[PDB]
Paper text:
ADPT01871 (herein referred to as mAb 1871), a S2 subunit-directed Ab isolated from a COVID-19 convalescent donor, displayed broad β-CoV binding, SARS-CoV and SARS-CoV-2 neutralization, and blocked in vitro cell membrane fusion. Cryo-electron microscopy analysis revealed that mAb 1871 binds the upstream helix of the S2 subunit, interacting with partially conserved residues, providing a molecular basis for its cross-reactivity.
For this purpose, we focused on the high-affinity [name] S2 subunit construct comprising residues 757–1,291 along with a C-terminal T4 foldon trimerization domain. Analysis of cryo-EM micrographs and 2D classes revealed three Fabs bound to an elongated structure reminiscent of the post-fusion SP of SARS-CoV-2(22), SARS-CoV, and MHV(32). As previously reported for other postfusion SP structures, the core of [name] S2 subunit forms a conical shape that is approximately 135 Å long and 50 Å wide, having a long three-helix bundle formed by CH and HR1, with a three-stranded β-sheet wrapping around the C-terminal end of the CH bundle. Each 1871 Fab interacts with two [name] S2 subunit protomers via a conformational epitope consisting of UH, BH, and L2, with UH contributing the majority of the interface with 25 interacting residues. Residues from heavy chain complementarity-determining regions (CDRs) H2 and H3, light chain CDRs K1, K2, and K3, along with four residues in the kappa chain framework, form part of the interface. Furthermore, the CDRH3 of 1871 Fab forms an anti-parallel β-sheet with the UH residues 811–815 via interaction through three hydrogen bonds. During this conformational change, the epitope on UH becomes available for 1871 binding, in a way that stabilizes the UH region in a similar way to the CR interaction.
Numbering used by the authors:
A (entry chain G), B (entry chain H), C (entry chain E): 1 to 125
D (entry chain B), E (entry chain A), F (entry chain C): 22 to 91, 282 to 495
G (entry chain L), H (entry chain D), I (entry chain F): 1 to 109
The structure:
Amino acid sequence: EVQLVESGGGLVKPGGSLRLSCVASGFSFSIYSMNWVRQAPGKGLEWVSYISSSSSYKYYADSVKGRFSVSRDNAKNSLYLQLNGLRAEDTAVYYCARDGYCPKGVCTYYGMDVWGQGTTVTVSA
Amino acid sequence: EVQLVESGGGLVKPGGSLRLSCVASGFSFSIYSMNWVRQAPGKGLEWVSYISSSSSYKYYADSVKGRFSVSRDNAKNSLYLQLNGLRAEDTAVYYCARDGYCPKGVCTYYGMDVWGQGTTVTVSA
Amino acid sequence: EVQLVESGGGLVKPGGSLRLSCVASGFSFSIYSMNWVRQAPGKGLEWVSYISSSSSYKYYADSVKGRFSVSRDNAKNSLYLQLNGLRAEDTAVYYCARDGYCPKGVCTYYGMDVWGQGTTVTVSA
Amino acid sequence: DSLEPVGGLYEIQIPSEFTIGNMEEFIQTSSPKVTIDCAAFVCGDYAACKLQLVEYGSFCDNINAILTEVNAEALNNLLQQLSNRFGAISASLQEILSRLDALEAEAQIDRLINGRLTALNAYVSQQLSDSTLVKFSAAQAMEKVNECVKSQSSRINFCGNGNHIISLVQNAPYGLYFIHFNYVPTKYVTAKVSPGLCIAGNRGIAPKSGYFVNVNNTWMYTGSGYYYPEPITENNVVVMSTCAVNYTKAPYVMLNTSIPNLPDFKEELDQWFKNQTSVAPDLS
Amino acid sequence: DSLEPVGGLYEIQIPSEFTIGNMEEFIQTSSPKVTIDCAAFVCGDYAACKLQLVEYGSFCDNINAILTEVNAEALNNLLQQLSNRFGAISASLQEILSRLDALEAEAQIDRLINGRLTALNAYVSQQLSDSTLVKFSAAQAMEKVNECVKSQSSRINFCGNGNHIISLVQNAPYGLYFIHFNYVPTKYVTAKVSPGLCIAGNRGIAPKSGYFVNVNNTWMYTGSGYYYPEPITENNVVVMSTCAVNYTKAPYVMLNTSIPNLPDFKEELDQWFKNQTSVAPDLS
Amino acid sequence: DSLEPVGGLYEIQIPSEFTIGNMEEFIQTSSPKVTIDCAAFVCGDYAACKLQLVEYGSFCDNINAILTEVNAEALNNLLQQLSNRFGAISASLQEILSRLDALEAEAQIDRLINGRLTALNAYVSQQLSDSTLVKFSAAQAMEKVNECVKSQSSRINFCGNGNHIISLVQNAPYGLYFIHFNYVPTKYVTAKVSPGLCIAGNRGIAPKSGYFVNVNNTWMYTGSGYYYPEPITENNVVVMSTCAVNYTKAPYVMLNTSIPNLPDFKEELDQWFKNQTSVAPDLS
Amino acid sequence: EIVMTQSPATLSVSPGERVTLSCRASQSVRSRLAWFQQKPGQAPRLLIYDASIRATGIPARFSGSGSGTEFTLIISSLQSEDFAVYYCQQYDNWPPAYTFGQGTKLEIK
Amino acid sequence: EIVMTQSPATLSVSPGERVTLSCRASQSVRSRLAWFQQKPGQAPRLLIYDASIRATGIPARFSGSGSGTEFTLIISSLQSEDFAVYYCQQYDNWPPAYTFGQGTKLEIK
Amino acid sequence: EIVMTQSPATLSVSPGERVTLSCRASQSVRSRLAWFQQKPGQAPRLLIYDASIRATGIPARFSGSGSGTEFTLIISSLQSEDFAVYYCQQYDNWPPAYTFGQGTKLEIK
């Protein structure tokens, strides 16, 4: 049905790079805003990045500002997250979530109703 | 006093062309919006076209869209209607009326208070 | 403390020119609108000119339009008034005052609370 | 008894029969969070418009924070030089012509961008006008909680229709759901009413929480909420110092938005308009 | 006589005589249909402005739907060629120079078009803010129909001034015309009122639909609507558990519109500003 | 007895003890005078932006009035001429290239100017919506002066909480400061209430300014403002024609702003887009 | 397309009789409804606009009321000159798309 | 031009006496009214703005009231230092066009 | 930054018992709060948004209330499948800057 699937998770040496993909299916991905949320091992959820449907407005948590870059391809119904300069703190399970309806550039918010199953990013030596 | 006068009506073969004119007098024609309304023989009134005081916004009924063209010359205080591709259904008495006040591009509406005496378009073989 | 000091006053022959200055101190002059108000000998106060913090909008009393010009230099925290074509009626004590907080181009008005001690312009043959 | 009408004679309906009513009502008290994707609002997916809209600045962040309320050798040498000079001139004209076409395309994109930012600003002002109308509706729902749910209202036709009995409220998405119980009038008596009565022209009376009804050609008193005529006593009237009516008129107020008078376009443009005509040099 | 003031002592006015009043008021409930001729608003009759404003899109349709709420021989050969080359260069420069004048004139027209669209958007926002205030006024008229015309109000100073008797409503252009009949206090007694009284320092009372007035140095009860002091009984007071006042401060709310962030103009422009100094080639 | 509930059975709180309350609140009735600089707002102190914004017109005067609610010899001769023709060609190219650089810089300044006028219009729109909410708040303060200060209100939970005694009003900066004295409930009785009772299945009754409370398995009447159950008499009930509830539903109203129907950007642009590709002439 | 329906299309009335002409709109036109009178061989005359506002010079006997989808024109004391064809017209939304009712004929009786 | 009138221009008063200074405007200036005090040989001092808001440091005895075309400055307990000239000023609309009152002189008694 | 404080982090409850989970905000987030449920080894599931609106398909036993800085999630009749970790999230202002609560674990008894 309405689903998000993350990929691109695995082991990365500290300070390295990794790229996460979140291919959407079952809904109009091109008009939804999307989020990246990571869950550290045995900790609460942390919002990473927000990208708008038009890709023009991208926002990041300060803990990842500059090091992480979010992008989307509404033609491919895909959401990407480039994890550059990975540190120990970036070890988590990364979720993509659906945020804002934005049918014609005008956005309405009804919670992060749809989430992905996540992928694990393990950053250790 | 304040009146509208139609002209340019008469017999026209089907598929022909006519040019109705509605010269205004007694009011500030350059700021009023105008309408064309036709009355078929023994039938109700039908709104043909609307033209704004600046002539930039012209609107037509779907039954005449494409085949009829409305124009105005606020310098000559006259309103025109090009009756192109006249069919049998276009046989009627054609009226012009004021619609909107628009003193400085801001239009207020108080009904089609002023009407013309009409002119008769007869389209038959 | 918060003060306006006005200089450039003195004796001027009729039809001549004089230039008043009002250097501000103690407040953020670059975001305040300013006024010039003159008090004729034994008469009530008269508003001469208004200048905005951006200097883009300057306004004058009808009695001094054309002949008086107001200017400001927010880098020097100074307010100037050019008294061109001085007449007999322009003999007064000239004041400057603040007229609007305008912290970011948005002006709020709390009265002309700060005034200057004034300067005297005597125009006679 | 020489009782004369004071204020005229008016036919109005006084209830005579009631039934128990149940009115279920929604009052909106909030809105969903609304922001604008200004790039998607103006350009859609057109990438040439979104490239040019980046240079318009961060107005969306401002708008959205408002919405969310935060001599043979020489001749050959001359022919060699002329080939290079005309090569540099032709190259330069090409670079000029490419920048002229770019400037004209960008100007046409800016006009559709600017027109769609005027439609954007109209929507922002409309969304801010629904924002205040929801706030007005949120204050009306809190007045019904305070006066219909947390108490019993003595106001008729407020917690539904008729005379309030009991109200209940439930949370509904973006509002409150009210259930009103009241006894509403189902039948009325059309009675002849005078606002007051004069006695011998000296002292006037006014009905105390009721109506002066002329029945059987004699002036009687009835309660306003139920038609039960009864003799005029001192318990159901208020003594007026005089039976002359004090006529007043509240000031006439009509919201008529003033048109923002603008100067003549050409006259204002002519203060700075540079309609130069450029003439290329004559080159033999 | 050991009653003690609770809440302080306040001099307030209690009515002592009344007269019948007739207040006539208009309440607006609707507006004329308003649309904008954006071409006439921005340009007037200036045809250059309207021609350039056509390229701004159909924003007026969007605004109006918001307002309505829807070796020698070769030298001669070279001389012949140079005449054609300089002929094509001079012709090209003229086409370039004509397109540069067009671009500069269109740029200045765009600035005045854009400035008058900012004035247009301010007026659309003002029209939307007035239509919101009309909707607020249309609700106030319907509250007066329900509570002043379709019933009798116990609210004082609501259906005009004083105590409501009867109201009439008539249709008026863009609203409703109300005629109110009341008995209005024309003279008042300045009375010494305490919000409540403490009995023996242990039990407190509150006046039931009335006031506690100190008359002849003894505390008496009077109805709020008419000054008639009377002994304090159990039928005109409410027993308070304690005669201590429960003080409360409602939240302080002042509407202060927040100024936008809007970074420095030059710093933001410098992210994409291509300030180039093009240099013409040196041609021999 | 055979009295039967009409409308269902509900648990509601009926006051059983009260205390004297003092609520102090500020209600805003006005705002400071607000105008926009529109040049400090858009440009700040940047002089290039101010110079270019002067050409946008006097929209600020319009916005502020809205805010304030107002052979060998021949060859040598050819070389001399070529040095002049290339002198004039290279001179005009420089003049062209200077006007091309100026036009591109002004186009970028216009884009940021236009973007900050959109943010300006959003702020003027927000100021107009806040000044509408202040007018709504100014009307609420005048209602409290009329009904809490100029009279005593029978509305519970209007002049503060509980039952109104007396209100005072003082001027406060940009509003009015109310002091409300009332007796507010501090303890309630959770009573099983029916909106009405059916007698023998034939005639129903409604509680007159009170509640029908099932106390000790018999239906009794109590006043709504205080829990004092008493036998049901004909003085504290209203006779209903039938004991069937008349169910009605108020219309469902939710403010959902309609998104404007903007066309596709590329198609609307293509109605007039040029998309020219200019090629320089070939010069040998 | 908002369809305007007037029923009945015909009415037999006598002078001095109250007449109510009903108009219904397939969609809510709010208060953007006008009433027109068309005597034979003459142009339509605007009677009521905004569903209840009499046009200038229109006699007080012509009264309009209603909003939304139900509108009525009241001729309190019908006269001999009121025997004409009466239309209702809607001008609610934008763009202009104006639709009239098919008329109601007042026949003498 | 919004002409502003203060009457009477002169008032003989004694210390400890309440004195009211009346200001009127030829048009409604709403609440855009300010009160100024000008002791001899000194610049004007802003007392009241917005017709009722005391400026900072202004003693509580100076009170302003009114709106529209009628304004008043109240000096509840007049002191020996209040014998000055008092002006009212209006700043209602846009553009800035500021008009003062002719003054009111408090003379000792 | 707005910090979501969700206390107590642990709650031992039994099936059929009413459970209240408290969420607090370092500053008023108005009504922009959501409730999430995260069973072990699964993604978070949105329960409530706008602080009181149930998401589609969410059982009626999950109820949300509150505004400003005080929020609560009510599980009226706790079932065996409600023993999960519950978070609150705020999405109040612009730009997006989303902060969750540290969670609340429901342990079987």
